[PDB]
């Protein structure tokens, strides 16, 4: 019965984590900021600095 879908009677929350590990290197260090090489505009819309 699709009521159960529209009601979400049987629906599940799915948390997940992506682990991002920036390490020490002879290249330097992987500075996680919004300093993106070659990035468009619509792709930064929901991103914080």
């Amino acid at each position: 019965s699709n009521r159960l879908v529209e009601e979400d009677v049987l629906t599940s929350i799915h948390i997940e984590e992506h682990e991002i590990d920036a390490r020490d290197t002879k290249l330097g260090a992987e500075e996680i900021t919004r300093d993106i090489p070659n990035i468009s505009d619509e792709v930064l819309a929901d991103l914080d600095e």
Binding site: K26, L27, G28, A29
Partner: protein
Amino acid sequence: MLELLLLTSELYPDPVLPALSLLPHTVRTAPAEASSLLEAGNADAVLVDARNDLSSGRGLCRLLSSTGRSIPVLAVVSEGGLVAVSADWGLDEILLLSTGPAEIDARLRLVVGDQESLGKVSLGELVIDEGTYTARLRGRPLDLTYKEFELLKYLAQHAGRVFTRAQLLHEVWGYDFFGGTRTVDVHVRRLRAKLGPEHEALIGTVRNVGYKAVRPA
């Protein structure tokens, strides 16, 4: 962000600009008089109310736009008196009463002067302005050859990265004179001199790899 002196004989700024409390701007308030001209000081911008007194508002905006007052002046007027206000009052910008808070922040940033420094590279005390092409140290001009500067800026712009002589030859000595690595050391020897030991900590050397730059604390 801005220390703002409001010119109102009313005690509060919230009947004047209701959104103004919504920002962290520190709004000193002073009576709508000429004596408040002495109370300018280090006010970032002056807020002259001409919502009601357009004649004396014109007088006060002329007063804050005299021969030696660089503090930017805002006429805060009604909507039926915006057409009475133009560039004659010594102005660059004005604020309505229904100006929004993000609108207040935007127009206050625009009336103050954002204004980001050009290719002004900075590595510790050694700050480079490639524009004028000076790698000045603590304000004094520094004298490098054509190559040392471009050598230095590259490392300055890539401080910490462990470069190699073979690597550095390409981006400093271009695609030519492809042999003779030790040109680096002979040049490095001069670099480490004309830098001075006080900031040779910037210049790092690892055996068997070459040279680098290090950000100081």
